[PDB]
């Protein structure tokens with residue numbers, strides 16, 4: 001369709017959109033992986049042991 | 055600078071091969087064809103065909119050297135057991 | 148004309164990277180030279196960032212490397228990348244050299260390119276050896292002792308060479324401070340030999356897997372072989388990351404986490420995996436002087452191959468007998484490494500002797516005899532009377 | 533070599549931190565430090581571990597400040613050049629029992645007990661060897677072996693004779709959290725604490741490697757797609773030959 | 781109350797038949813010895829026979845039969 005002259009054509013905002021998305025991708029990708037890791041290892045972490053030794 | 059001693063390869067226009075006459079080439083754009091088209095009919099046809107050819111040149115050597123490492127490692131462990139202490143004092147001298 | 152062709156500096160980039168004519172039929176084995184160039188950049192960059200925190204004094208050295216691991220931000224990433232990056236650099240080089248041996252790239256008109264490469268290999272074993280000694284654990288001290296005492300057998304001049312190499316009467320502080328300054332230097336000499344290596348390739352260009360001329364069908368480098376090289380760059384980074392982050396000490400020895408002590412000898416002094424086949428060649432010679440000659444001769448017998456191959460065809464693609472003995476030589480090189488990691492005991496003594504002979508007989512007795520037999524078989528199969 | 537001079541092979545126990553997505557169990561580290569302080573520290577040093585690195589891992593900040601103040605450290609000299617002392621602070625390192633190697637060998641019949649900061653990484657077998665050693669002392673040595681006076685037998689040490697005697701026994705430590713302090717229980721917590729001492733980046737490293745392996749794995753598949761698209765003209769190109777007239 | 785858990789499983793697998801096929805061989809060696817270095821010229825023996833090999837056989841089977849079943853019970 002006409003995605004060409006808004007998405008593909010304009011390389012000025014392509015390289016712009018490549019970089020602008022690189023910054024946003026990092027923030028959400030970090031938060032997602034750190035939530036999966038901390039949940040897979042629930043009961044071993046210090047912040048949970050610290051609560052059990054009350 | 056000056057020209058140096060010449061080669062067996064040139065550049066575009068004077069690459070240095072024989073003169074060609076009577077050959078025609080045809081091609082189609084990649085945008086006009088579909089990619090990832092047949093890569094099974096590739097890993098099952100051609101990889102298995104390429105394997106079946108060049109596998110007796112690699113595996114008969116591998117079988118001779120691995121058998122050799124075996125019979126040595128087996129014999130060493132016998133020498134340093136208690137049932138092979140008499141042989142050890144024979145061969146180590 | 149275009150700016151990329153007219154500018155003094157971009158003209159060299161264009162002629163080497165962009166418009167270079169390449170044979171249409173080269174395969175993925177021709178991608179190893181690109182990887183060896185990324186390897187050298189990884190090691191030089193990671194090493195300079197560690198040198199900011201390293202101390203070369205023999206009383207401070209082991210504890211400086213543990214200080215990079217514990218106190219430096221992301222310092223465990225720099226070391227494990229660096230330590231495992233040297234194991235990967237050597238594996239890609241053995242595959243690069245084995246390719247050229249299979250496809251006949253040593254032959255004329257490319258004899259000069261093969262010889263500059265043999266030099267790079269020697270200077271690269273030297274670099275890695277000097278760096279392992281700078282950790283100064285227990286494999287570091289006793290490995291330098293065994294190798295430096297070999298030069299005390301040279302007639303009438305040997306005990307002067309070891310004391311000048313040591314800076315004293317044993318492996319001590321002056322030895323460890325001079326080995327670090329030389330270890331920083333030699334990587335910049337390897338880089339200058341890599342430029343001379345590329346100049347000799349530009350004259351005749353690259354060969355191809357069929358062993359015939361490639362001047363009838365050529366493809367430019369940009370956007371056929373640049374994007375083919377990205378494929379193997381990302382596979383290299385992936386496998387390396389898997390070792391750095393999930394198994395970072397499997398390609399090492401535990402004794403080098405013990406600090407270096409001249410008064411306690413280890414029960415097994417063993418080199419890294421990539422110097423073991425040459426270490427088995429040395430141990431196989433009963434005499435000390437002949438052993439150190441036979442070990443260095445194992446590297447420089449590669450220069451004899453352009454004159455011992457007696458064939459009219461380049462490469463092994465259409466050669467049946469010469470394929471069988473290429474793979475005999477490869478698996479004989481893997482047994483020498485195994486025997487180099489064993490104790491000096493029956494039957495591993497005679498095994499390493501017979502296998503040291505087969506290493507040398509390949510270049511000097513096998514290749515000339517099978518090449519001549521194959522030539523004559525091609526003739527009588529076609530011309531029969 | 534014989535099997536005795538090499539040592540007995542350590543088995544494979546199912547440690548809770550083995551795996552690419554696993555972390556250390558931090559309640560076992562906390563219990564392990566208690567076994568170190570009350571059993572091991574009489575004759576072993578821990579010179580490469582600082583007090584501050586325990587905060588947020590096994591103990592609270594207020595707890596660690598009180599443990600450090602129970603030791604005295606050399607201060608800088610006074611206004612007249614005479615030496616002083618002071619209590620410990622968080623930037624100090626965990627002190628050892630002996631002042632030099634001669635006093636250590638004197639108190640252990642000539643033998644020197646090694647520092648334990650890197651003992652898990654400096655031995656073949658890792659945690660499986662440390663655990664099997666402490667729990668491997670038999671009742672009697674096997675009939676025939678002649679030990680020197682002052683040596684003890686356990687088969688996991690190369691040679692068979694070790695200068696350490698058995699030091700672990702049931703219910704010598706009373707745990708704060710009510711765990712039964714059997715021999716194996718204390719050995720497991722000791723080895724877990726010691727592995728953290730050698731690898732204090734274990735948990736962060738395994739989580740940054742999940743990020744790096746996911747990113748690079750998708751770039752590798754995207755690169756295969758892009759290559760096969762840009763190479764499709766060359767792979768399907770066709771050639772025809774019509775022999776010319778040799779007039780020329 | 782709770783004894784050493786390893787000592788329990790170590791003690792249990794010594795009552796299987798690939799347990800006593802390794803206990804007895806280790807012993808009768810321990811018998812056979814006794815005499816084999818008791819006697820005269822023993823301080824003057826050349827080679828006195830021992831039993832580390834057969835001990836090792838028993839404690840290799842027993843360990844890699846007990847390794848995957850212990851930490852299930854240790855807290």
Ligand SMILES: CCCCCCCCCCC(=O)OC[C@H](COP(=O)(O)OC[C@H](O)COP(=O)(O)OC[C@@H](COC(=O)CC)OC(=O)CCC)OC(=O)CCCCCCCC
Nearest residue numbers: 173174175176177235238239378379382383386756759760
């Ligand atoms: C340490 C890490 C370094 C990183 C890179 C190392 C790569 C070295 C591997 C050796 C080599 O370079 O030659 C490999 C050779 C095949 O080369 P060829 O040009 O003849 O066949 C092109 C293909 O058909 C089309 O492959 P195509 O371009 O169509 O698709 C790409 C392919 C990716 O393959 C590669 O990355 C090649 C390394 O996509 C897939 O595989 C999809 C599955 C996810 O294969 C062989 O002839 C035998 C291979 C077995 C022996 C390897 C033992 C080495 C120790």
Ligand SMILES: CCCCCCCCCCCCCCCCCC(=O)OC[C@H](COP(=O)(O)OCCN)OC(=O)CCCCCCCCCCCCC
Nearest residue numbers: 108112176241242244245246249356357445446464477480
């Ligand atoms: C001092 C210097 C001494 C250095 C000694 C070098 C020893 C290093 C060992 C490196 C191993 C690499 C071996 C492969 C060599 C690369 C070149 C090669 O083998 O050619 C690939 C060949 C291609 O097939 P074709 O014959 O059909 O030709 C192409 C089509 N026109 O197809 C083949 O030949 C088969 C390819 C399969 C390769 C895998 C076989 C080896 C497997 C285990 C090797 C273990 C190494 C650790």
Ligand code: HEM
Nearest residue numbers: 190191194195197198201230233275278279281282331334
């Ligand atoms: C071809 C390039 C290089 C190679 C092959 C190489 C190889 C090595 C090796 C094998 C080690 C020992 C690894 C270990 O700790 O187990 C090492 C250590 C070291 N190297 Fe390099 N090196 C190279 C370049 C450099 C450069 C240019 C520098 C300095 C700028 C450097 C600095 C160091 C330092 C400081 C160490 C200390 C130990 C460590 O941090 O691991 N290296 N090197």
Ligand code: HEM
Nearest residue numbers: 177178179180181183184244247252264265267268353354
């Ligand atoms: C260590 C750093 C090295 C670098 C950066 C390097 C780089 C390269 C590159 C980019 C190529 C062209 C692509 C290819 O053929 O793969 C090449 C080709 C070649 N290299 Fe190297 N190389 C190195 C070491 C060596 C060594 C050690 C040898 C041999 C002992 C060697 C011998 C050759 C030969 C013979 C060719 C031509 C192969 C052919 O055209 O068929 N190089 N090198």
Ligand code: HEM
Nearest residue numbers: 571572574575640643644645646651666694695696699722
């Ligand atoms: C739970 C308590 C302890 C643990 C985990 C421990 C740990 C260790 C370790 C890992 C070794 C090294 C073994 C090897 O080199 O393979 C060792 C050796 C040694 N330990 Fe301990 N230790 C403990 C308690 C003690 C105590 C309380 C003493 C003194 C009363 C002691 C005296 C020694 C000696 C003398 C050695 C030297 C062994 C030799 O070189 O023959 N250990 N210990």
Ligand SMILES: COc1c(O)c(C)c(C/C=C(\C)CC/C=C(\C)CC/C=C(/C)CC/C=C(/C)CC/C=C(\C)CCC=C(C)C)c(O)c1OC
Nearest residue numbers: 163164180181182183184187188191192195338341342345
């Ligand atoms: C066949 O055609 C090819 C080809 O296929 C390939 C792959 C290549 C690609 C390249 C190579 C094969 C290798 C060439 C590589 C070199 C000469 C490497 C030089 C290496 C370096 C590491 C230079 C580093 C210099 C620095 C200044 C970085 C070091 C430290 C820094 C930045 C820290 C300081 C920072 C601060 C903030 C103070 C070709 O050139 C080529 O043409 C022939």
Ligand SMILES: CCCCCCCCCCCCCCCCCC(=O)O[C@H](COC(=O)CCCCCC)COP(=O)(O)OCCN
Nearest residue numbers: 150151152153154155156157158159160161338339342343
């Ligand atoms: C040194 C290692 C040995 C191998 C040789 C290295 C070659 C690789 C160099 C890599 C390419 C560098 C890009 C140069 C960019 C174009 C330069 C240019 O515009 O030329 C000049 C301007 O350059 C300068 O003022 C200083 C450039 C310094 C660059 C330092 C990196 C443009 O002027 P002009 O249009 O006349 O082009 C030159 C025609 N011969």
Ligand SMILES: COC(=O)N(OC)c1ccccc1COc1ccn(-c2ccc(Cl)cc2)n1
Nearest residue numbers: 273275276279280290291416417418419422426
């Ligand atoms: C990576 O470092 C090690 O593996 N080192 O060195 C500390 C080590 C460690 C333990 C035992 C032996 C060694 C040495 O083994 C070898 C075998 C050959 N060379 C050699 C060295 C220089 C030159 Cl020019 C040519 C050949 N070195």
